[PDB]
């Protein structure tokens with residue numbers, strides 16, 4: 001069937017949203033275009049890159065972006081990863097569905113927290129695929 005589009009939006013496009021994009025392309029790649037953005041943009045967190053590298057997923061080529069309206073309007077599903085993203089997300093046109101999957105912000109925390117959030121996001125995406 002026609003490939004769908006999922007857009008992960010978080011406070012920034014530095015950690016949670018980048019790991020979601022990484023997992024999304026790996027798990028949902030066959031039937032989904034996967035993108036990510038932040039309400040704010042502050043570079044990709046090197047620890048998020050390393051966290052994904054540890055599970056053989058390369059996100060070193062990702063970029064930190066604000067929301068692209070063109071992609072947004074053509075998205076089938078928008079997933080917010082933080083309450084700030086949930087609240088600051090633009091009013092979505094009727095053709096776009098929206099869900100909130102919250103995760104803790106690993107910024108400034110110890111290494112194991114990046115691993116923890118990485119794997120919680122992995123689980124959420126694996127469950128999503130089973131719908």
Ligand SMILES: [O-][Cl+3]([O-])([O-])[O-]
Nearest residue numbers: 012014015016017
């Ligand atoms: O994607 Cl976040 O940078 O909000 O973690």
Ligand SMILES: [Cl-]
Nearest residue numbers: 028030031032
């Ligand atoms: Cl799929």
Ligand SMILES: [K+]
Nearest residue numbers: 036037063065
């Ligand atoms: K991005």
